[PDB]
Amino acid sequence: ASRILLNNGAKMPILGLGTWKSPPGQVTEAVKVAIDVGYRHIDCAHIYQNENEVGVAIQEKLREQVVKREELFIVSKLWCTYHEKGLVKGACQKTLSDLKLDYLDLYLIHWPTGFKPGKEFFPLDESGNVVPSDTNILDTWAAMEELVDEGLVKAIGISNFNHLQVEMILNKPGLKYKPAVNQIECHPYLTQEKLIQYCQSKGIVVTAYSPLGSPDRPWAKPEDPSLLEDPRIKAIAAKHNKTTAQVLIRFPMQRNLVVIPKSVTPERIAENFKVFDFELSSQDMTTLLSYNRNWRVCALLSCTSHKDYPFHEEF
Numbered sequence: 305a306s307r308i309l310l311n312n313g314a315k316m317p318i319l320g321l322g323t324w325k326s327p328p329g330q331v332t333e334a335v336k337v338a339i340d341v342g343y344r345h346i347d348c349a350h351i352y353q354n355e356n357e358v359g360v361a362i363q364e365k366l367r368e369q370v371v372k373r374e375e376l377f378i379v380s381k382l383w384c385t386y387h388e389k390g391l392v393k394g395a396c397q398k399t400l401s402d403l404k405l406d407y408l409d410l411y412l413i414h415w416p417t418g419f420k421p422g423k424e425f426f427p428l429d430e431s432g433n434v435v436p437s438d439t440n441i442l443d444t445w446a447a448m449e450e451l452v453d454e455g456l457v458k459a460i461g462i463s464n465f466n467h468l469q470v471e472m473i474l475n476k477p478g479l480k481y482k483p484a485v486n487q488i489e490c491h492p493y494l495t496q497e498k499l500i501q502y503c504q505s506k507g508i509v510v511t512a513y514s515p516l517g518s519p520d521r522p523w524a525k526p527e528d529p530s531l532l533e534d535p536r537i538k539a540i541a542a543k544h545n546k547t548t549a550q551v552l553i554r555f556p557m558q559r560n561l562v563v564i565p566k567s568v569t570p571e572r573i574a575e576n577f578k579v580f581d582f583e584l585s586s587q588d589m590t591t592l593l594s595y596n597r598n599w600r601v602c603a604l605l606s607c608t609s610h611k612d613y614p615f616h617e618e619f
């Protein structure tokens with residue numbers, strides 16, 4: 305099936321288009337091509353600095369009646385410098401304005417770590433440490449709940465939350481809305497079995513980011529493992545007459561995950577969507593799972609002393 309049921313009663317497309325690192329002069333065409341070839345979910349964020357341009361594409365396709373607003377599933381994220389109560393609505397409303405939407409289908413807390421508010425997305429001290437905010441995540445969550453009650457967002461969720469942090473929200477006194485989604489890094493080198501089983505056991509849908517191992521990550525090193533070039537994965541793809549990317553996107557689909565590969569390349573955008581026509585065997589799935597090496601693309605390395613840094617914990 306193309307969509308998965310959320311704990312808010314809405315359906316979320318299991319395949320979406322990622323937009324981190326999509327250049328502002330390429331992303332409008334990338335999103336327009338994506339909608340034309342069947343994507344109905346776009347993953348966005350204010351700190352990707354391209355929401356205006358994503359929005360231009362969405363609006364054109366709504367205007368052209370290629371799609372109806374109800375058929376789209378648009379996701380964005382609250383940056384770390386907006387965890388204060390008083391700043392959450394404005395940050396949401398800036399994203400809405402940029403995307404030229406009157407609601408978000410899903411709004412996520414981008415990281416559990418709050419940072420000092422200001423113009424800087426990564427405010428730094430004299431030695432390069434991130435300057436934290438004393439806001440705690442449960443107060444941030446109440447602010448996210450308010451956004452649902454004001455009709456600005458249909459669902460709220462979290463991202464890069466470890467199991468104890470998901471637990472903290474689930475055990476929040478006075479909890480009004482559970483998180484719908486936890487969006488986390490997930491691929492055959494970071495298989496996330498423990499955290500996925502915890503979230504799914506609680507009715508929280510997991511979204512897999514960097515599913516192709518983010519080859520365009522700004523900090524890529526030559527010595528790093530490459531999913532797209534791993535002969536073992538290429539062999540599975542060749543057996544199925546699919547590309548390696550296509551196996552990497554179908555893998556999380558069969559774990560009941562949502563997945564959000566990024567591309568600005570028209571041919572790759574179309575390719576990446578043709579993953580509903582084949583199935584990986586359970587053996588293929590267990591084999592892909594065996595490649596785990598707890599390798600992360602996104603480790604937020606400037607925030608390792610933050611009290612809420614999520615990746616000291618095993619999971």
Ligand SMILES: NC(=O)c1ccc[n+]([C@@H]2O[C@H](COP(=O)([O-])OP(=O)(O)OC[C@H]3O[C@@H](n4cnc5c(N)ncnc54)[C@H](OP(=O)(O)O)[C@@H]3O)[C@@H](O)[C@H]2O)c1
Nearest residue numbers: 322323324513514515516517518520549565566567568569
């Ligand atoms: N919540 C968070 O903290 C968080 C963190 C990281 C990512 N995300 C979200 O997850 C998305 C996906 O992650 P990501 O951007 O890190 O990386 P990714 O989707 O794993 O990899 C994107 C890279 O793969 C290339 N690519 C795409 N399709 C390909 C194909 N069929 N064959 C060969 N190469 C292909 C893209 O190239 P071209 O673009 O040049 O075609 C780009 O260089 C992001 O864009 C963002 O929306 C969220």
Ligand SMILES: NC(=O)[C@@H]1C[C@]2(NC(=O)NC2=O)c2cc(F)ccc2O1
Nearest residue numbers: 324349351352414601602603604605
């Ligand atoms: N260092 C990290 O782990 C993250 C990853 C990350 N990518 C992403 O999609 N969400 C993120 O927060 C990101 C994106 C940026 F635009 C700038 C920094 C950045 O850092």
